[PDB]
């Protein structure tokens, strides 16, 4: 039903012992939440530039 992504939430809890969310196969050891959250840290600026 239009569901499913590269990564699949496994029975393993997110790396962070404070994150109640599980870590996906493409987000591990972090989860979808943290994963993206971390990305912000590193940025290449505007696509154009
Ligand atoms: Zn997490």
In brief:
16% of the residues lie in helices and 0% in strands. By secondary structure, the protein is an all-alpha fold.
Protein architecture, described:
With 49 residues, the chain is mostly helical. The chain has one domain (6-43): CD2-Gal4, CATH 4.10.240. The protein contains one helix and no strands. It has one helix at 32-39. The structure holds zinc ion. Zinc ion (ZN) binds at residues 14, 16, 19, 21, 30-31, 33-34. Zn(2+) 1 binds at residues 14, 19, 31, 34.
Total domains: 1
Give the termini separation: 38 Å
* CATH fold node name: CD2-Gal4
Ligand inventory reads: zinc ion
Number of helical segments with 4 or more residues: 1
Q: What top-tier CATH class fits best?
A: Few Secondary Structures
Strand content: under 5%
Organism: Homo sapiens
Protein name: A20p50
Subcellular location: Cytoplasm
PDB class: hydrolase
């Amino acid at each position: 039903g239009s569901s499913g992504s590269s990564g699949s939430l496994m029975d393993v809890k997110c790396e962070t012992p404070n994150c109640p969310f599980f870590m996906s196969v493409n987000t591990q050891p972090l989860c979808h939440e943290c994963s993206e959250r971390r990305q912000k840290n590193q940025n290449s600026g505007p696509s154009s530039g």
